[PDB]
Tab-separated table of C-alpha atoms (C1' of nucleotides) in Angstrom:
chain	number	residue	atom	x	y	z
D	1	UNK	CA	13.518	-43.165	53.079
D	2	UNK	CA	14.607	-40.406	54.318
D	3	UNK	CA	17.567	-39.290	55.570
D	4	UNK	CA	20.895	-41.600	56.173
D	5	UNK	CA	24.682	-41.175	57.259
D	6	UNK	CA	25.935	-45.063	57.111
D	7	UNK	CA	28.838	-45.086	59.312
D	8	UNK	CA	31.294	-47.870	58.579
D	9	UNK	CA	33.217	-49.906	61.588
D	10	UNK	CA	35.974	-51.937	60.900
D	11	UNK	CA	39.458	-53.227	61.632
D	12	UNK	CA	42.628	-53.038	59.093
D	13	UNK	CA	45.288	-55.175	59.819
D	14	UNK	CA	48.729	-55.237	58.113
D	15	UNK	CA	49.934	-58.649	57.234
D	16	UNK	CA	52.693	-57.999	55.407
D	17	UNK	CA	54.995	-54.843	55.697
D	18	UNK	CA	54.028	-51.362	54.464
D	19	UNK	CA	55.795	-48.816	53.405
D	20	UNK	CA	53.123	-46.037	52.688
D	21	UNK	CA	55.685	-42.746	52.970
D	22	UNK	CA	55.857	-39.224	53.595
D	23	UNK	CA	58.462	-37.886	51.430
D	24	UNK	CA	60.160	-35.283	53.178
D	25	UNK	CA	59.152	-35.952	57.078
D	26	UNK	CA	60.596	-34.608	60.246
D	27	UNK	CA	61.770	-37.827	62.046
D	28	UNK	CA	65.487	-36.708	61.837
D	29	UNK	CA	67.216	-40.040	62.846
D	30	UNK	CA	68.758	-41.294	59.834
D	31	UNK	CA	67.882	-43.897	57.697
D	32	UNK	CA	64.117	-42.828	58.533
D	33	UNK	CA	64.304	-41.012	55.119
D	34	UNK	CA	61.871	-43.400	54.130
D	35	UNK	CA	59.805	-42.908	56.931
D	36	UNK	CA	56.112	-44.112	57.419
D	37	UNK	CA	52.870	-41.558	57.330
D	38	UNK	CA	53.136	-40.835	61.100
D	39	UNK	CA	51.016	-39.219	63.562
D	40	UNK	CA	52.916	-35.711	64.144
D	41	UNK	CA	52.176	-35.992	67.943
D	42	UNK	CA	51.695	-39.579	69.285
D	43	UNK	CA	54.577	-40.947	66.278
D	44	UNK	CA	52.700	-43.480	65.910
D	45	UNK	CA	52.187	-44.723	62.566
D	46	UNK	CA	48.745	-43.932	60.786
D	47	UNK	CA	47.372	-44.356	57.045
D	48	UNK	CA	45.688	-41.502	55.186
D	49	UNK	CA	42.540	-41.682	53.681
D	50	UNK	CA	43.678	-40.155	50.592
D	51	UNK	CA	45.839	-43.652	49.878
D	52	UNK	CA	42.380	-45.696	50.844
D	53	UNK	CA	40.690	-43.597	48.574
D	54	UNK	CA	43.397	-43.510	46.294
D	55	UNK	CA	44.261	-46.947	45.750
D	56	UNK	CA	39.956	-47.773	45.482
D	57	UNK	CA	39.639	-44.458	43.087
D	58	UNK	CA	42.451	-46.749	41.053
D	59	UNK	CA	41.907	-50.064	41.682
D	60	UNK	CA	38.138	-49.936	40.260
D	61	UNK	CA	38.504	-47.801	37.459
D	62	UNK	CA	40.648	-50.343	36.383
D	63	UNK	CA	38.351	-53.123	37.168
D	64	UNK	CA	35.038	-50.834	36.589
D	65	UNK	CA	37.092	-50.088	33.363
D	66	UNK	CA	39.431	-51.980	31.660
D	67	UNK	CA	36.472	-54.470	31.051
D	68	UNK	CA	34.634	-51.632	29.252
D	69	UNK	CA	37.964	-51.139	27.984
D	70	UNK	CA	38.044	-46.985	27.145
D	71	UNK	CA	41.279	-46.710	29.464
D	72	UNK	CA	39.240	-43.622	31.691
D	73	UNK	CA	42.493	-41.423	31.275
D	74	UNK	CA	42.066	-38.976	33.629
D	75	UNK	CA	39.651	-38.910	37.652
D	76	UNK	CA	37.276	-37.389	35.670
D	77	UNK	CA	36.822	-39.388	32.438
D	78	UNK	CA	35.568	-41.930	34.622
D	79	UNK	CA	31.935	-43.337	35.053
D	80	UNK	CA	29.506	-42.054	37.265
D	81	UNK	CA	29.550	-45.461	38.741
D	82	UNK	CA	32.502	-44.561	40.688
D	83	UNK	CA	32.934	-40.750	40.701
D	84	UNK	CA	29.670	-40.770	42.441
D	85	UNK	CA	30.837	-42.020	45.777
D	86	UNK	CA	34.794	-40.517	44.764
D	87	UNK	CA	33.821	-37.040	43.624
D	88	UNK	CA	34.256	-35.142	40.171
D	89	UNK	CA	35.092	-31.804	39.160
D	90	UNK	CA	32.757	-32.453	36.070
D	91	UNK	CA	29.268	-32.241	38.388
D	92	UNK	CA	31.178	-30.453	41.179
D	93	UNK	CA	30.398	-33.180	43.527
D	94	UNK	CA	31.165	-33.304	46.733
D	95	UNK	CA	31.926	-36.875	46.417
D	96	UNK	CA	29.890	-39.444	48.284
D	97	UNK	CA	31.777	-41.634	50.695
D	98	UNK	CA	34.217	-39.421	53.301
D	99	UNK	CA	37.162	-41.946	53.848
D	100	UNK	CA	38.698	-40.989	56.966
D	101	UNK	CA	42.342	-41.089	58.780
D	102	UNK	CA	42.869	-44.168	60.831
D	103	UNK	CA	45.759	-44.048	63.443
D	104	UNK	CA	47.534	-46.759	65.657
D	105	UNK	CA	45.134	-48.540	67.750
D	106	UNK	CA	46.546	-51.180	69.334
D	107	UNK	CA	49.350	-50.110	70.494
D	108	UNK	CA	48.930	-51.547	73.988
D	109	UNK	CA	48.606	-55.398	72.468
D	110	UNK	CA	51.992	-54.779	70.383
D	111	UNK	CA	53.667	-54.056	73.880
D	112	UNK	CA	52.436	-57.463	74.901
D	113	UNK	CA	53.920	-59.569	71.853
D	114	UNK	CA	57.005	-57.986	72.803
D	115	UNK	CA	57.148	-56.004	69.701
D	116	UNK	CA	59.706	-53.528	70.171
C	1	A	C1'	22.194	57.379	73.297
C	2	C	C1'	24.405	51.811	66.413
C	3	G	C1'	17.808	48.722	63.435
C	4	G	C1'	20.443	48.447	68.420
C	5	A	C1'	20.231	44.690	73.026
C	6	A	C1'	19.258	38.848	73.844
C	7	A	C1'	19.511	33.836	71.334
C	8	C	C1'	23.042	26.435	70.063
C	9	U	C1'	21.711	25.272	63.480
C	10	U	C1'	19.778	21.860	67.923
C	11	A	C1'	17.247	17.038	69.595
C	12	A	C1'	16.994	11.727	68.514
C	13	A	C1'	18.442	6.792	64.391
C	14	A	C1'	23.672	0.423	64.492
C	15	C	C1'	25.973	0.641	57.293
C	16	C	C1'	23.396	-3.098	59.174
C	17	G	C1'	20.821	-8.228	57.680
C	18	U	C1'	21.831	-13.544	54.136
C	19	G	C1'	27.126	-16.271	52.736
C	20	U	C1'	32.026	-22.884	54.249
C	21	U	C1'	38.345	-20.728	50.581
C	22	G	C1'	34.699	-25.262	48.815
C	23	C	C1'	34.712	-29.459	45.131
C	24	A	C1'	37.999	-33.830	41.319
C	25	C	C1'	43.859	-35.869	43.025
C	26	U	C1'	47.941	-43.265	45.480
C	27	G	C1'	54.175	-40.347	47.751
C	28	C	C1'	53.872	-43.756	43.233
C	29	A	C1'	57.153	-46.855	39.210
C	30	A	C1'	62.307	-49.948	39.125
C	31	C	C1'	66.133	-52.823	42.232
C	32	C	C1'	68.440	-60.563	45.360
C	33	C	C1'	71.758	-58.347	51.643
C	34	G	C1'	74.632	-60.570	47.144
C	35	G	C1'	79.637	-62.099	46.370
C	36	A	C1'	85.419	-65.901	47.350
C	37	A	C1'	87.493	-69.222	53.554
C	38	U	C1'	88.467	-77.489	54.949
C	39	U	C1'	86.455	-77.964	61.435
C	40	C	C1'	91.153	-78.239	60.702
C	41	U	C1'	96.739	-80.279	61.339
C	42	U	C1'	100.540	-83.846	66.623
C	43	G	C1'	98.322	-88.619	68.713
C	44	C	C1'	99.109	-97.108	68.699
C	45	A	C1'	94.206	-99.357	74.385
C	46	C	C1'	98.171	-100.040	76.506
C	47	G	C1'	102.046	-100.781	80.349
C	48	U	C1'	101.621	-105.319	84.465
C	49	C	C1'	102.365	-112.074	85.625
C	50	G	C1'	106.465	-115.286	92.031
RNA sequence: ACGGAAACUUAAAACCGUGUUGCACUGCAACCCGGAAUUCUUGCACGUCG
């Protein structure tokens, strides 16, 4: 009981499409306007852990809410229940739950389906 | 032989020690790769029998 960092593995897999964008990248090819969040070095295309948290900040205050029903209008009207692991500016928490980048992994196995 | 004639205001001592430009934040909501073009017009299973 003391203390505890619980690291959490894991593999994300699109199965659709995704179109998670940057806005106003640097790709500079054309009709890459609406590009993809890439890595700047690699070009490779990653996902930011501000969507991951920002789609599970939304997607359960909804469903942490909208059972309880009070709407939880703004990310700090909502419960402890999920600003403790997401962070508040109410108890100046730090959050609890430090969703990182993720990048491109395999790379090398999309080479070998022929994916160009 | 001038209350004269000589003399350093001098020697050392760190403006240092404790301190995150930090915490809450979806690059998101809306759109059919969709509408009009005949696989067609010329064409006989037949010439041939002491």
């Amino acid at each position: 009981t003391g203390y505890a960092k619980i690291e959490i593995t894991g593999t994300i897999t699109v199965v659709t499409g995704l179109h998670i964008g940057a806005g106003d990248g640097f790709s500079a090819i054309g009709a890459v306007d609406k590009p993809v969040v890439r890595d700047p070095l690699t070009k490779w295309p990653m996902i930011p852990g501000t969507s991951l948290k920002g789609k599970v900040r939304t997607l359960l205050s909804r469903q942490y809410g909208a059972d309880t029903e009070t709407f939880y209008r703004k990310p700090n009207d909502d419960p402890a229940q999920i600003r403790r692991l997401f962070g508040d500016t109410k108890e100046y928490k730090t959050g609890r739950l430090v969703f990182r980048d993720t990048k491109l992994t395999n790379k090398d196995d999309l080479e070998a389906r022929g994916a160009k």
